[PDB]
Amino acid sequence: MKITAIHLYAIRLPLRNPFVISYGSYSDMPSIIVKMETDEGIIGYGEGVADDHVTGESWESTFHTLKHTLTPALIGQNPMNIEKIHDMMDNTIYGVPTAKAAIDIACFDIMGKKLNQPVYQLIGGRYHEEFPVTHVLSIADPENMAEEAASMIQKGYQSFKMKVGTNVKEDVKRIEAVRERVGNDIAIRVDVNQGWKNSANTLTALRSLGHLNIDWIEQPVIADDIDAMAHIRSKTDLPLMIDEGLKSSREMRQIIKLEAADKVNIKLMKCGGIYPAVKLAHQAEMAGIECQVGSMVESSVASSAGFHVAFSKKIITSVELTGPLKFTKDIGNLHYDVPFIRLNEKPGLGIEINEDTLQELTVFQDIVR
Amino acid sequence: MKITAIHLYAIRLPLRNPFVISYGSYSDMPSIIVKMETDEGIIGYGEGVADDHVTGESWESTFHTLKHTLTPALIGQNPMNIEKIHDMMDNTIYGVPTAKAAIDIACFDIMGKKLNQPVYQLIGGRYHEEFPVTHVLSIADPENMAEEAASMIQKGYQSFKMKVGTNVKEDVKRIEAVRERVGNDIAIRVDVNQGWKNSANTLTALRSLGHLNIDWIEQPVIADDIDAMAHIRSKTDLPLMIDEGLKSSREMRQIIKLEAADKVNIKLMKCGGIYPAVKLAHQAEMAGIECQVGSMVESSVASSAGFHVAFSKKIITSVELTGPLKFTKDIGNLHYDVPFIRLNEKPGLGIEINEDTLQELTVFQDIVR
Amino acid sequence: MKITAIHLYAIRLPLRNPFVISYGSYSDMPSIIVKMETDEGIIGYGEGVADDHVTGESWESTFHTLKHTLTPALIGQNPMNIEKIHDMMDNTIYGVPTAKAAIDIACFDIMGKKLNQPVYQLIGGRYHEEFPVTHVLSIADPENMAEEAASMIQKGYQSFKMKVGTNVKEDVKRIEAVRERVGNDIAIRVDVNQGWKNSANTLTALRSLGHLNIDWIEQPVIADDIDAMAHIRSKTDLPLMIDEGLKSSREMRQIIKLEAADKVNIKLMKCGGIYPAVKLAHQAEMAGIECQVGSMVESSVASSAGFHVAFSKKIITSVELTGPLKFTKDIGNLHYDVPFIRLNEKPGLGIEINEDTLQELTVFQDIVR
Amino acid sequence: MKITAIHLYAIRLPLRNPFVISYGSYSDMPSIIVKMETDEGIIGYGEGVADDHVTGESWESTFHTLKHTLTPALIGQNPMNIEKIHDMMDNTIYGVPTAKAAIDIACFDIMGKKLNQPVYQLIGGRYHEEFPVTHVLSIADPENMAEEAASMIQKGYQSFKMKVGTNVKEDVKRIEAVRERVGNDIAIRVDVNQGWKNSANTLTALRSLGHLNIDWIEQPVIADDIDAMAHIRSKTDLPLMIDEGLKSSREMRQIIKLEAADKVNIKLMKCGGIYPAVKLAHQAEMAGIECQVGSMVESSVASSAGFHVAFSKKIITSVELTGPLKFTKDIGNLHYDVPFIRLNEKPGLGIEINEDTLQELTVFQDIVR
Ligand SMILES: N=C(N)NCCC[C@H](NC(=O)CCC(=O)O)C(=O)O
Ligand SMILES: N=C(N)NCCC[C@H](NC(=O)CCC(=O)O)C(=O)O
Ligand SMILES: N=C(N)NCCC[C@H](NC(=O)CCC(=O)O)C(=O)O
Ligand SMILES: N=C(N)NCCC[C@H](NC(=O)CCC(=O)O)C(=O)O
Ligand SMILES: [Mg+2]
Ligand SMILES: [Mg+2]
Ligand SMILES: [Mg+2]
Ligand SMILES: [Mg+2]
């Protein structure tokens, strides 16, 4: 089996509602789709949703890094030799996890189809039967956030993720409002997306959150400040999760060494795909750090890849991949059972790509042979 | 696919020559073979060679732990759900890595045969094309050790592993003798198997080894003393490898935290098989610790499993599985190309089991259904 | 004095009521009894109750490790040369503390009978006059646990050990229920048996236990995570006890180095018997760590051995050996004075073995000469 | 069994030759002998040789501490309840290890006689068969030291302990002279008795000792400076032993925590006797610290007690009790087999006290009832 050609599609996934977080607002999500072809006729799909603010990659830079830098050396290689492919990509260029993920995912999709097995079956097998789905509430006035929450509860949701990160006073008001609205049995986690900046502001905020039964506080300080996370952890009993501060094994090593967190948000776009995501899971397990597989809000393609990793590992206890539930159009057909997610047994990523939808969402494309 | 029955065979692999190390001498190697059957008719083989001195497991205790404790709960399970199977075994009993490895290996052999792929292809794919083979010199008079080395050089060997660990003075004499005999181009590594006990004796010995061009010193102190390894590492420039001191992720975490070694000897019998061996490799990689896949001197079955792990990972740079080259009888047919080892592309472990030889070496057996 | 033969008995001690803890439920307790004979006609009894989940030993594996690995080399040795016997067993096989304890206990019983002195008199003499007895409440609905507690109070008990470890919410409810029922003068300690897994869940739970006057929280996290215990200890003022996390001196060294606990639960089955239990006590004393001698729920034989250690050391301030109070049949006759335990002055373990009961509970046996 | 009376004898043991060390010179050794009587007629002997410079105890202060402070509360107690007796002495007065040792030794002598067993048989049993005896060379001109060494070699000695500690230049000259004289096969260890004061002077001295094959350097810096020992250990590969810096478990804890030494010199006079010496051995074993049982140069009584401890523990690898070989008169009859020491099987300390010699060496005495 050899890679014969790689199609690159620069698309834009339209959102039903604006997605608003501490460092940015989104009306749609630019994504790069990879269509990997092989001499045996097997086709694999991969995806890369770049978050400029997190990995230093953009929609346009990812397309070109894939076209000119990463894909050319891949023609002729066997998609199943994943360790080798990742080594080749790493020796070619440092970082660019999102671009690498796009390739990595397509390879696993092909491997699954070739062996007629779901991807999760190839990276450890089925461990989880299902995961609850958590609805993400975009930043807004405390009353609006509480209102959408009540509205989603009627839809079956029992777990919410509150986006905050503008001003401590306001963020606290937002969290208080939602909790009062949904009662105390509804699960709530808070994501600051680096909004509180440092330990001082964070600890001040945490003082007012002790009685709100918050499952965990996600990335309250700037990504690079692992020291601050450790300091905060030494002075609070609320569980702490690192997201932007964790990308590759480089940060995991530091998080483990400094005991900087209770949980980490692993994302295929931050580490380079399925294979490296799995390595991160194994590393976290060693230190007893609870893991979650989150996302940049992606199509059914990357979302599916994320679930396949999550379902195969005991250390991964929660998932956050709801892109297919937020977009008005999707190139894939990943099935959800809100308030739950369960994976079928279809080979590879277990999804079908609607090529008519793909072309429709395509702004520009190319092929590398 | 479901496990329908597990055959257990208590055998003894005869050695051509006595194997002599610091804490024991061996005339043959007791081993437990696992024959895993499935509803689909696929058969998988696993093996467990217990080293009492390292994991607290014996030939007889492993047979019974497998028969009464581990195998019963496995009937009905899918061999491909490896993460799940390992979780079930761990929730059933703590430790007993050798017994768990026997099961783990058979599952991968089945998975490989089922998907018609070599095991290495399922855990990362092919990375290495070959590995040089290192001949192990049993403890003996310096002149005898030097003599066997010269004799093996004529056989094509270019890398040797010296077993020492009786008395510092004598061990140094042994190492000096061999080096003088083989010249300075021949690779030599030294394994003390805990013989020097502590940092004081070790450092005294290292003073006399600086000019002998030794690749690395393996486990000079007692297994449990990780602190001593770190102390020694802080006062020497000779590479240090931990073997007995490393079993599972528990020790890896400590080795990483205390910066206790440059290299680690990963063995399927110490961690519970292929799956956990891979997790250890990923953990070592995070800390930039070079890995080796060694062995307890096993048949073609476990030896093959060890190579499949080694060939799939960039972090594993050397291998030490020569049981098939030391035994006068073997139940498997793993092919070697001394001074090198290369893996074929046959499915599963890629070996055929001679059942006539298996029965011939069997002392007692049983079946669990 | 020389060991002439060792009888091994694989028995099962029937429980009056099911014993239920976080990682398992028990209807009876499998045990291995050792009958050590000497050339002088003195007979000693030892016992090994294996907990698979804690030491990696099973009922069947212990019987065989004793039969094939440990006992053969003991024939001819003097039972009183305990340091030597332990060294011989350790050089023969690593770990297997339960199997080693079985031998160790029989040797002390013989030593006591030979010198016509209680065992405690041989390891430091009498220090304690008595110890209060704590009743262990198996996991159950908060109402059932509170009910049994009230019922046992009527029986004279004034100290209780609550077994929990399913779900933080539920565990807290269980603890609140019992405390409300028994009032605030009754002593209560909580054992999670690793149920809360990590520091995050543990600290969340501890928030709700501050006003319940709990003497100490025992092993809230997984055994191997000593780091987590230290972290928890740095953020709470409730006393912390390590149980499963402590087996031999290897863990004690780490517990002391990381200041991971206030108290430790020493058990003969985890360290290899009386002699090593004493060494652990001496080690704990150096660091000012309070000690307790607990148990796996054993017959009068091992239970007695445990008390003899406890009564001879000032650092051991509490005991947890109630197997004889839980079984419907016992091969020994250890006398209790609920709510207290006091040791008589009879030689050796100070108990008589009813051989008719022994044979009755025996499933299989053998003799090594 | 109860203590009915304690005789105290203030004696002086005459030396054949002056004993000269870094901080003092001795023509004879003042010692306090204890004769413990019991209601059962069993008599036990103990001894306390005080070194003012090490424990803050003198010949006269020890006699009176025993007479007025320690012995009165002991009348009526059972000598075999050693843990209790030590607790009573510790609650009565802090420190004074030498006075406490005198009592402790007599109790064990009685326990041994009562049970008709050697003391070593009561604290672990026989482990060692023999120990080589090391001759101690008092400080003197390099030529005189080398001369006595050659003279003692003719007497069968093969191991020497060089006393130095005046001036680095001179000490180095002394060590060079002896080594040149005896050749390189003779074992030599160096004891500075705090003479080099700090790490700077010590490290300067060590530069010139690297090629002299010295087994270890004993206490080069002032006793209280454990930090200095750790610093020196971090910059040298010569084994380091702490003597004066180690008295009780308080220092052991610190030595272990700071990794300040490779070996420690345990002495009954520094820790309070046999029982606490054993606890120190157990503590050292945990950290893998090699132990030696040294002495203040005592009569056959304390010397015997020291050997009984040494012979019962694997962690104790060398002994330094040669008082009986240095005195012209001794109240005891401990048998030596230079160049070796072996213990007989006589009960208790296994020695007979010549009361005529005792009275002859007595300057003043008293009895407490
Ligand atoms: N810049 C882009 N394109 N995306 C950023 C997403 C933020 C990310 N995901 C979320 O918050 C929702 C994940 C989900 O449910 O799919 C975070 O955890 O912070
Ligand atoms: N007790 C038993 N059965 N085996 C012990 C083997 C020792 C091990 N292997 C070796 O030295 C040789 C590995 C090889 O070449 O297969 C070690 O590295 O120390
Ligand atoms: N698996 C077996 N067979 N036993 C496990 C006992 C648990 C142990 N003992 C107890 O909880 C009661 C101790 C007593 O009272 O004897 C613990 O402390 O966790
Ligand atoms: N002040 C008095 N009374 N004695 C001091 C003896 C010094 C001690 N012993 C010795 O050097 C010789 C031990 C012997 O061989 O018994 C030391 O190790 O430094
Ligand atoms: Mg986030
Ligand atoms: Mg090795
Ligand atoms: Mg417990
Ligand atoms: Mg000294």
Inter-residue contact B146 to B181 (CB < 8 Å): yes
Q: Which residue has the tokens 């295929």?
A: A268
Q: Any idea what DSSP says for residue C327?
A: B
Does the beta carbon of B64 lie under 8 angstroms from any beta carbon of chain C? Answer: yes
Name the residue with the closest Cα to ligand 4, atom 11.
Answer: D136
Residues of D in contact with B197 (CB under 8 A): 288
Pocket-testing residue among B297, B300, B319, ligand 2, by greatest number of atoms within 8 A of Cβ: B297
Interface of C with D in 200-259 (CB under 8 A): 249, 252-253, 256-257
Whether residue C239 sits in one domain with residue C324: yes
Chain B hits for C221, Cβ within 8 Å: none
CA distance D2 to D42: 10
CA C279, C281, C284, C285 torsion: positive or negative? negative
| d(C-alpha C262, C-alpha C240), whole Å | 5
- Rounded to whole angstroms, the Cα distance separating A359 from A357 reads 6
Quick check: helix, strand or coil at residue D92? helix
Is residue B266 a contact partner of residue B290, using CB atoms and an 8 Å limit?
A: no
Tokens 């509803």 belong to B39
Residue D26 · residue D52 · CB < 8 Å = no
Chain centroid to CA A112: how far?
Answer: 21
Helix C249-258 crosses helix D274-286 at what angle (to 10 degrees)?
80
Q: Which of B59, B64, B94 sits opposite C56 (nearest CB)?
A: B94
Residue with tokens 């002077």: D201
- To which H or E segment does residue D152 belong? helix D142-153
Q: Which DSSP symbol is given to C10?
A: E
- What are the Cα distances from residue B303, in Å, to A158, B98, B157, B241, B341? 50, 13, 19, 21, 11
* Furthest C-alpha separation in chain C: 60
Q: Do β-strands C131-132 and C340-341 pair in parallel, antiparallel, or remain unpaired? A: antiparallel
**Do both D132 and D236 map to the same domain?**
yes
Same domain flag for B98 and B163 = no
- Taking each helix axis from N to C end, the angle separating A274-286 and A249-258, rounded to the nearest 10 degrees, works out to 10
In angstroms, the CA D234 to CA D80 distance is 44
- Torsion, Cα of B53, B54, B57, B60 (10° steps): -50
DSSP for D266-327, written as a single string: E-HHHHTSHHHHHHHHHHHHHTT-EEEE--SS--HHHHHHHHHHHTT-TTEEEE---HHHHB
Q: What is the token pair recorded at C345?
A: 């002055």
φ/ψ of C33, rounded to 5, equals -105, 140
Residues B91 and B130 placed together within one structural domain of the fold: no
Q: In whole angstroms, what is the distance from residue C115 CA to residue D114 CA?
A: 9
Interface of C with B in 16-35 (CB under 8 A): 23
**From ligand 8's centre to the CA of D244, what distance in Å?**
7
CA B161, CA B174: separation in Å to the nearest integer? 12
Separation between Cα atoms, residue D243 and residue D226, nearest integer Å: 11
Tokens (6 digits) for C33: 């009894």
Q: Look at residues D289, D182, C87 and name the one whose alpha carbon lies nearest to residue B201.
A: D289
Interchain contact C1–D (C-beta under 8 A): no
Q: Establish how many alpha carbons lie within 13 A of residue D362's alpha carbon, considering only the half-sphere containing its beta carbon.
A: 17
Gap between the Cα atoms of D158 and D137, Å rounded? 13
- Indicate the DSSP class of residue A25: E
Strand order in the sheet with C159-163: C135-137, C159-163, C187-191, C217-218, C240-242, C263-266, C290-293, C316-319
Inter-residue contact A146 to A78 (CB < 8 Å):
no
Give me the residue from C56, C69, C250 closest to B95, CB to CB. Answer: C56
Largest CA distance in chain D: 60
Structure tokens at A241: 């999760």
Q: Distance of CA A12 to CAs A29, A59, A229, A321, A330, Å?
A: 6, 9, 35, 17, 10
Query: In the structure encoding, which two tokens stand for residue C240, read together?
Result: 């912390």
Chain C residues near residue B69 by CB distance under 8 angstroms: 52, 58, 60-61
Both B64 and B88 in one domain: the answer is yes
CB-side neighbour CA atoms (13 Å) of A192: 31
Q: What is the 3-state secondary structure (H, E, C) of C264-285?
A: EEECHHHHCCHHHHHHHHHHHH
Same domain assignment for residues A154 and A203: yes
Residues A255 and A135 in one domain: yes
By the 8 A CB rule, do A206 and A173 touch? no
Per-position b or e across B4-25, b if 16+ CB within 10 A of its CB: eebbbbbbebebeeebebbbee
Q: Is the dihedral of CA D118, D123, D129, D133 positive or negative?
A: negative
Q: Could you tell me the resolution of this structure in angstroms?
A: 2.0
Longest distance between any two alpha carbons in chain A, whole Å: 60
- Is B90 assigned a catalytic role? no
* Amino acid type, C246: L
**Tokens representing A319?**
């998932």
> In CATH, what number is assigned to the domain containing residue D35?
3.30.390.10
State which ligand 2 atom lies nearest to the alpha carbon of B298: 16
Bridge-based pairing state of the strands C159-163 and C135-137: parallel
Token pair 């501890």 is found at C206
Least CB-CB distance to C225: which of A234, A263, A288? A288
Listed in sequence order, the residues at least 6 apart from A241 whose beta carbon sits closer than 8 Å to its beta carbon are: A189, A216, A217, A218, A219, A261, A262, A263, A264, A265, A292
- Three-class SS state of A358: helix
Q: Does A285 touch chain C (CB under 8 A)?
A: no
Q: How many CB atoms within 10 Å of residue C192?
A: 25
Distance A297 CA to ligand 1 centre (A): 5
Residues D78 and D175 in one domain: no
Instruction: Tell me, yes or no, if D83 comes closer than 8 A to chain B by beta carbon.
Output: no
Domain hosting A285: range is 116-350
Determine if the peptide bond prior to A339 is cis (ω within 30°).
yes
Cα gap B249→B275, rounded to integer Å: 12
For residue A59, the tally of other CB atoms under 10 A from its CB is: 19
**Rounded Cα–Cα distance for residues D150 and A368 (Å):** 87
Q: In the structure encoding, which two tokens stand for residue A107, read together?
A: 């390879």
CA of B89 to the centre of ligand 3 (A): 21
Q: Are C135 and C160 in contact (CB under 8 A)?
A: yes
In a 3-state reduction of DSSP, which class is residue D132?
strand
Amino acid at residue number A368: V
Rounded to an integer, what distance in angstroms lies between the CA atom of residue B290 and that of residue B292?
7
In 3-state terms, what secondary structure has residue D93?
coil
| Pairing mode, strands D3-21 and D263-266 | unpaired
Which chain A residue's Cα is nearest to B86?
Answer: A124
Classify residue D155 as exposed, middle or buried by CB count within 10 Å of its CB (0-12, 13-18, 19+): exposed
The closest alpha carbon to B358, from B3, B6, B13, belongs to B13
Q: Is D237 a catalytic residue?
A: no
Other beta carbons within 10 angstroms of residue D328's beta carbon come to 10
Phi first, then psi: give them for residue C107, nearest 5 degrees: -65, -45
What is the length of chain C? 369
DSSP calls for D165-211? -S-HHHHHHHHHHHHHHH-SSSEEEEE-TTTTBSHHHHHHHHHTTGG
Residue of D57, D243, D244, D251 marked catalytic = D243
Determine the distance from the C-alpha atom of residue C29 to the mean position of all C-alpha atoms in its chain, rounded to a whole number.
Answer: 13
The answer to whether residue B227 is catalytic is no
With a CB cutoff of 8 Å and minimum separation 6, the contacts of B35 are: B6, B7, B8, B9, B43, B44, B45, B106
Count of CA atoms in the C-beta half-sphere (13 A) of A257: 15
CB B34 within 8 A of CB C38: no
Contact C94 B55 (CB under 8 A): yes
Return the residues preceding each gap in chain B, C–N over 2.5 A, or none.
none
Q: A219 CA to middle of ligand 5, Å?
A: 7
- C-alpha D325/C-alpha D330 separation (Å) is 9
Containing A101, the helix (H) or strand (E) segment is helix A97-115
Which helix (H) or strand (E) segment holds residue A285: the answer is: helix A274-286
Structure tokens at B189: 């590594």
Distance CA D304, CA D317 (A): 16
SS3 D4: strand
Helix, strand, or coil (residue A368): strand
Pairing of strands B340-341, B362-368: unpaired
**Which residues have a Cβ under 8 Å from the Cβ of D167 and sit 6 or more positions away?**
none
Can you read off the two tokens belonging to residue C340?
A: 């207290």
Residues A317 and A294: beta-carbon distance below 8 Å: no
Kindly list the protein residues whose Cβ atom lies closer than 6 A to any atom of ligand 1. Answer: A 21, 29, 49, 51, 136, 191, 193, 243, 294-297, 320-323
The number of C-alpha atoms within 13 Å of A142 and in the hemisphere containing its C-beta is: 15
* Chain mean position to CA C338: 18
| Whether A27 and A70 share a structural domain | yes
> To 10 degrees, what angle do helices C142-153 and C168-182 make?
30
User: Over the Cα atoms of chain A, what is R_g?
Assistant: 20
Which residues share a beta bridge with C162?
C137, C190
- Strands of the sheet containing B362-368, edge to edge, are B43-48, B24-38, B3-21, B362-368
d(CA A253, CA A283): 8
Residue C264: CB within 6 Å of ligand 3? no
Size of interface A-C (CB pairs under 8 A): 25
Of D186, D156, D27, B283, give the one whose Cα is nearest residue A252: B283
Contact D113, D1 (CB under 8 A): no
CATH code for the domain in which residue B177 is found: 3.20.20.120
| Amino acid at the residue D221 | V
Residue A30's nearest CA partner among A66, A69, A57 is A57
- Distance between CA D164 and CA D171 in Å, rounded? 6
Terminal CA-to-CA distance of chain B, rounded, Å?
Answer: 15
Task: Write out the two tokens for D348.
Answer: 């208790």
Parallel, antiparallel, or unpaired: how do β-strands B187-191 and D362-368 relate?
unpaired
Q: Is A241 annotated as a binding residue?
A: no
CA of D83 relative to ligand 4 center, distance in Å: 28
Residue type, D315: I
What's the gap between Cα B279 and its chain centre? Answer: 16
Torsion of CA A65, A66, A67, A71, to 10 degrees: 130
The count of structural domains within chain B is: 2
For residue B269, give the ligand nearest its CA: 2
- Give the distance, in angstroms, between the CA of residue C190 and the centroid of all CA atoms in the same chain: 16
Helix (H) or strand (E) holding C204: helix C199-207
How would DSSP label each residue in C51-101? -HHHHS--HHHHHHIIIIIISGGGTTS-TT-HHHHHHHHHHH-S--HHHHH
C-alpha distances out from residue D286 to B283, C86, C178, Å:
28, 15, 40
Q: Is the CB of C321 under 6 A from ligand 3?
A: yes
Structure tokens at A249: 């094994």
Residues C267 and C359 in one domain: no
DSSP β-bridge partners for residue D45: D35
Experimental approach taken:
X-ray
Do A109 and A209 sit in the same domain of this protein?
A: no
What does the DSSP assignment read for A32-97?
EEEEEEETTS-EEEEEE---HHHHS--HHHHHHIIIIIISGGGTTS-TT-HHHHHHHHHHH-S--H
**Spatial separation of the C-alpha atoms in residues B335 and D40, rounded to whole Å:** 78
What is the distance between the alpha carbons of residues A23 and D229, in angstroms, rounded to a whole number?
A: 54
Residue D356 sits in the same domain as residue D261: no
Nearest residue on chain D to B225, judged by CA atoms?
Answer: D288
CB C9 within 8 A of CB C358: yes
Q: What is the DSSP letter of D164?
A: -
Ligand 4 proximity of D295 Cβ (cutoff 6 Å)? yes
Q: Which of C167, C196, C198 to mutate to test the interface with A (most CBs of A within 10 A)?
A: C198
- Which of B113, B267, B270, B326 is catalytic? The answer is B267
Q: Which of A113, A122, A254, A279 to mutate to test the interface with B (most CBs of B within 10 A)?
A: A279
- What would the 3-class secondary structure string for chain B be? CCEEEEEEEEEEEEEEEEEEECCEEEEEEEEEEEEEEECCCCEEEEEECCCHHHHCCCHHHHHHHHHHHHCHHHCCCCCCCHHHHHHHHHHHCCCCHHHHHHHHHHHHHHHHHHHCCEHHHHCCCCCCCCEECCEEECCCCHHHHHHHHHHHHCCCCCEEEEECCCCHHHHHHHHHHHHHHHCCCCEEEEECCCCCECHHHHHHHHHCCHHHCCCCEECCECCCCHHHHHHHHCCCCCCEEECCCCCCHHHHHHHHHHCCCCEEEECHHHHCCHHHHHHHHHHHHHCCCEEEECCCCCCHHHHHHHHHHHCCCCCEEEECCCHHHHECCCCCCCCCECCEECCCCCCECCCCCCHHHHHHHEEEEEEEC
> What is the rounded CA–CA span in Å between residue B334 and residue C171?
54
Opening angle at CA B7, ends B4 and B10, nearest 5:
165
Q: Is C178 in the pocket of ligand 3 (CB under 6 A)?
A: no
Interface of A with C in 259-278 (CB under 8 A): 259, 262-263
Are A107 and A46 in contact by the 8 Å Cβ rule? The answer is yes
List residues near ligand 2 (CB under 6 A). B 21, 29, 49, 51, 136, 191, 193, 243, 294-297, 320-323
> B366: which 2 tokens?
């049983």
User: For residue A19, how far is its CA from the centre of ligand 1 (angstroms)?
Assistant: 9
